[PDB]
Ligand binder design. Structure first.
Ligand code: F9F
Ligand code: F9F
Ligand code: 0JO
Ligand code: 0JO
Ligand code: CL
Ligand code: CL
Ligand code: CL
Ligand code: CL
Ligand code: CL
Ligand code: CL
Ligand code: CL
Ligand code: CL
Ligand code: CL
Ligand code: CL
Ligand code: CL
Ligand code: CL
Ligand code: CS
Ligand code: CS
Ligand code: CS
Ligand code: CS
Lengths: 268, 395, 395, 268
């Protein structure tokens, strides 16, 4: 499918950036997680980034570590995540869905079979956090064979060789990392680096989404003004879940408010 | 692109977030440069000799092999400054850190011996050291926590997951992914992403080089086998490296069997796990059906890790090295035996290697065999743990 | 009648109950015989090298002398098997015990390092070991109690008197006076009745012999001074012996000043006591006006003794060696300084010697001086004591 | 004076051995100690062996260690011991009095002055426990200059040279050690060694008193029958003191009974 290509074309026509929330699938349980995701979409999310719970998420800080733990406490497995994904797609036919994966979960029972499952349920992209471009060949090959976009990362200090590889190997969108470190709302990334944004465009890379530490509308506006196609926010969204565990209605109201504000900022 | 091969057959690689690739490439280039630098080699040699106390003794057991055809020597890494083999490669990596213009060190530790090594090297060479240690290990290896702090290192308890070595590893790598501009990650075992398994081997290989020279001097031949415990794999690869091309010399690695392989409470992925990707490497690991990383277990904190370095996975695959396991109770018996019959208190990690050598002797007592056990550390850190056990046991 | 001179000037002798004189004469004859026996010398040398780890390193301090004209080396007895210099002479005395047909060992211990040495040598050489230790020392040097027992030694707490080293000494000698037919008294310091001060010196003298060779190699000259802490006097005489005839080399012994000489809570009889007869010798001791033996005090159990070996009293009397004192607080500062700036955790006994060397440097920082400190042991046994202090202190 | 010579002549005329109790001076206090000593004499002691409390008595086992400690708890000093000795002598002009000393107490403020004090108060012998014959010269010289008998020890394994030295250097009586070890009632010494008794006589040694572990009348009889001139008992006597601290009248009655029985045994 062409879900990211179609989204970015539509956003361009409207002179708009993307707002893409991240949540952990099954946090704090399967049913509540499905309601959370429907709320994100209803409130204006342009695409989704969805985590499959993993035992040792080494690119995530405490907030998302804790999301993974809550999902595990609810007994969430990758198989249940794929069941959820099928239900999400069945409701929402056009929204791009990207998975945040750790390598072992993809490699586990065969890389090809993983990507084949993704295609079956209608996932659009997979980002494998601990697989750099240098180790990516079997992952990106399997992704493309199953019509899945493999997502690669452009770090702040990316050299020219890396820029060219990311532009060539990736599809769907390019991940523009705000900063070093791990996920976390408290650690605010720098302004989007115009030089990287411009080089990725020169090399015809998939459109850039800025992520890590994006927790406020101002940062979303700044990303789009710098020329990024949009922004991803995870920890800020997950904190709303964590805060409101005993108050599910309040959880959804606060998620709706936040997502709506972040999306409004993408029009800047 | 790398200067050196990141793989050992199928195993190894550089499975880290893209952000960290420049740091690994920088470390590899600095290592290749240093390895050909006579000034660096002279500085490292001087520290090993005059600060750490190399070469370490090779002790012939006088008592524990009586009435058998086994001759057993112990390579005395327990006599190295700091109390374990860990000190050797820390001195090399600390010099690399300085070479790269870094002023801070991150390390993980389980037994606290790598943490003690990191702290002592940082004090000596003027680096600011922070050490992650699982909270369970903070308790069961407590003497090492006191030692690290007295040397001015910051010791950070890790309560997540199993609160043991893998959890400390996770936190160390998370930290480094944000602090690499100023901090060197002084990984303490022959595992993790390239170039660490290579650097750690090359900065531990004096163990086997000295062993070879010492056994030739005393016996006029090579050993029939060299035996070492295997956590991440550093002391074993340090002992093995110089013997790999001596095809007659057996290389035996001992993983922790914990409460027994059948209980699932062990740390023996090389023989009982399956290949996975974690902690920057493709290697055997203990994992669930779905590919979640399992928590390991061993009485010994230094072996309590659910993976293993990729060179050991490789040497096993081609049959050049054999890997076995030893349970907590076997390790404890070997600990007691060495204390009472040789007057050496071994680390519980090292006691796994000794236990296997004692089994080789006892199972086949008329088999003529010349063995070397790598006695990777002293057991001061373990005496409270062992005491508490033997007492609860009713001894 | 004796084969060797029991006196050093006025000091020394054989002030024991008549019952024990044959045992002392037997020990002296066995020592004289062994000293001329190439097989004995070869056995002792082999144990020192291949079991204990000699020669020990001589480490140049890289950091603590910065900005001064002091060059400081540390003789690394902390790296000897067991963790202190005590192991050297125990290996020699254990071989003497076997030579004399004895199968049991009695020892006293304060810091627990001589007890650990006695226990390890007994395990290795097949002797049944019992160790007397003051009950206060059982508490403040507890890691060594665990070590001794794991090696199969019997550890007997002594509650009488000060419950410290002198009280353990008293009980050891009382025991020996009844058990000498089967037991060797493995006295752990250069004190007590002849021939112990002589034997202990001769079986510790490799410390200074190696130091001399090492400093000649590294500096091309002799040290301006060698500095050692003085309890009973073994590590100091071991360092001093080979330099006595090098008249340019200063010999500086450091007694424990405790809470301060003026408080009377110290262990510095050589400089602040007066000659008396106790523990088999005529030597300086801390005593009341009426001649009762006073209780000593030091933060360090190994120095907490109200007398001193007779050769030190002699060397002082003729001006060949100078003796000073260091207080508990000075020792603690030196302990902290070495941990944080050299990455070596010293025994608190050894920290007294270091503290004096640091004073020599700091008092006269533009004085050109090449110093060696005998770092008699490692501080693992002390880490709990020091921690508790620094915490109560509010650090 | 000739107090031991006179005693042994009298005992010989009566074909009798000596019974000599040991106590610590000032145990459990000065006044009670004086009463204890008068009781020992009234009950038949032929001579006394009296300890001056010392901080580190290395030839004594727990019983007498504890006697020393009780005297110290009562604040007993050597000066007070000499005051006691003067009072004992003033009451009892002929009984031989021997002191049990440790070297430091004799050496402390000058050996000569110590022996001069002993003569002043009328002490007959001094036994310095931790001074062997080999180190004895200044002690025995000072003793003889002040008409004090220096007492030397014949251990069970004494060789011929030692026998000759002890015979030559000693006066008053020769100490015949029962056994190795330290003082103590529980550790019974062997029968007197006839060979040593006979050799000491051949060499014209002062008459032998057997000591260490003598706690029963049977052992006293055995010593005399073997040819010793008598026996010393310390720990057995001191145990009676220790047992009866709260019952001073009972203490004296039991001391009297015991001493009387031990003395009766010396007639055997
Ligand atoms: O808003 P924050 O700070 O929580 O960031 C949320 C990001 N969630 S995500 O799935 O895009 C994401 C993307 C990449 C990650 O690691 C990698 F860069 F190494 F690949 C981890 C998570
Ligand atoms: O009856 P016991 O077992 O208490 O023995 C009591 C002996 N008391 S004593 O003064 O004769 C006495 C005599 C000699 C001593 O030591 C020495 F032999 F080394 F000199 C100690 C005490
Ligand atoms: C993990 C640690 N120690 C491991 C260890 C090991 C096992 O690690 P290697 O496989 O890397 O040698 C063996 N022996 C000793 C004395 C050890 O301390 C640590 O100290 O951090
Ligand atoms: C008395 C003991 N130790 C003394 C000691 C001393 C003082 O004793 P000498 O004066 O005999 O060296 C110095 N350094 C160390 C490490 C010591 O352990 C003992 O271990 O029994
Ligand atoms: Cl999979
Ligand atoms: Cl595509
Ligand atoms: Cl980077
Ligand atoms: Cl940090
Ligand atoms: Cl950084
Ligand atoms: Cl073989
Ligand atoms: Cl004898
Ligand atoms: Cl005994
Ligand atoms: Cl005996
Ligand atoms: Cl000088
Ligand atoms: Cl006096
Ligand atoms: Cl006379
Ligand atoms: Cs053998
Ligand atoms: Cs392991
Ligand atoms: Cs200097
Ligand atoms: Cs002293």
């Amino acid at each position: 499918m062409e879900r990211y290509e179609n989204l970015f074309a539509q956003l361009n026509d409207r002179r708009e950036g993307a707002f893409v929330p991240f949540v952990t699938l099954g946090d704090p349980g399967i049913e509540q997680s499905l309601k959370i995701i429907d709320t994100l979409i209803d409130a204006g999310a342009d695409a989704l980034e969805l985590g499959v719970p993993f035992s040792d998420p080494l690119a995530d800080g405490p907030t998302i570590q804790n999301a993974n733990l809550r999902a595990f406490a609810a007994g969430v497995t990758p198989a249940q995540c794929f069941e959820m994904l099928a239900l999400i797609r069945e409701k929402h036919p056009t929204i791009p869905i990207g998975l945040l994966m750790y390598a072992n979960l993809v490699f586990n029972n065969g890389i090809d079979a993983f990507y084949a499952r993704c295609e079956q349920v209608g996932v659009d992209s997979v980002l494998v956090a601990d697989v750099p471009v240098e180790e990516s060949a079997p992952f990106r090959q399997a992704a493309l064979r199953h019509n899945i976009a493999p997502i690669f990362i452009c770090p702040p200090n990316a050299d020219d060789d890396l820029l060219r590889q990311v532009a060539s190997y990736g599809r769907g969108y390019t991940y523009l990392l705000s900063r070093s470190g791990v996920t976390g709302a408290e650690n605010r990334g720098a302004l989007p680096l115009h030089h990287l944004i411009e080089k990725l465009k020169e090399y015809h890379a998939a459109p850039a989404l800025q992520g890590f530490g994006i927790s406020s509308p101002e940062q979303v506006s700044a990303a789009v003004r710098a020329g990024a196609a949009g922004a991803i926010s995870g920890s800020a969204i997950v904190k709303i879940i964590e805060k409101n565990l005993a108050s599910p209605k309040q959880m959804l109201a606060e998620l709706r408010s936040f997502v709506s504000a972040m999306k409004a900022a993408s029009r800047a | 692109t790398t200067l050196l091969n990141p793989y050992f057959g199928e195993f190894g690689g550089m499975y880290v977030p893209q952000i960290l690739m420049p740091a690994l490439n920088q470390l590899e280039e600095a290592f290749v440069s240093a390895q050909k630098d006579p000034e660096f080699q002279a500085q490292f040699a001087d520290l090993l000799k005059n600060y750490a106390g190399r070469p370490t003794a090779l002790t012939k057991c006088q008592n524990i092999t009586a009435g058998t055809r086994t001759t057993l020597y112990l390579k005395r890494e327990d006599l190295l400054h700091g109390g374990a083999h860990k000190t050797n490669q820390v001195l090399g990596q600390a010099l690399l850190a300085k070479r790269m213009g870094k002023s801070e060190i991150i390390a993980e530790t389980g037994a606290g011996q790598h943490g003690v090594a990191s702290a002592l090297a940082s004090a000596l060479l003027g680096l600011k050291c922070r050490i992650y240690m699982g909270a369970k290990d903070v308790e069961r290896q407590s003497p090492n926590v006191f030692r690290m702090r007295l040397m001015g290192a910051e010791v950070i308890p890790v309560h997540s997951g199993s609160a043991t070595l893998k959890d400390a590893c996770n936190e160390a790598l998370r930290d480094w992914s944000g602090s690499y501009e100023t901090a060197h990650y002084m990984l303490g075992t022959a595992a993790g992403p390239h170039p660490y398994p290579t650097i750690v081997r090359e900065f531990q290989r004096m163990i086997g080089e000295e062993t070879k020279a010492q056994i030739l001097d005393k016996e006029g031949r090579l050993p029939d086998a060299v035996i070492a415990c295997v956590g991440g794999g550093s002391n074993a690869i340090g002992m093995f490296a110089d013997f790999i091309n001596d095809t007659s010399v057996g290389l035996i690695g001992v993983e922790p069997g914990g409460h027994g392989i059948e209980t699932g409470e062990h740390g023996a992925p090389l023989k009982h796990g399956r290949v996975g990707i974690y902690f920057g490497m493709k290697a055997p690991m203990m994992q669930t059906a779905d590919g979640q990383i399992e928590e390991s277990y061993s009485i010994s904190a230094g072996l309590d890790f659910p993976s293993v370095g990729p060179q050991h996975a490789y040497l096993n695959s081609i049959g050049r090295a054999d890997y076995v396991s030893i349970t907590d109770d076997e390790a404890l018996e070997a600990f007691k035996t060495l204390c009472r019959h040789e007057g050496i208190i071994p680390a519980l990690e090292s006691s796994h290697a000794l236990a296997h050598a004692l089994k080789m002797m006892r199972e086949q007592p008329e088999k003529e065999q010349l063995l070397v056990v790598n006695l990777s550390g002293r057991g001061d850190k373990d005496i409270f743990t062992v005491h508490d056990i033997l007492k609860a046991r009713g001894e």
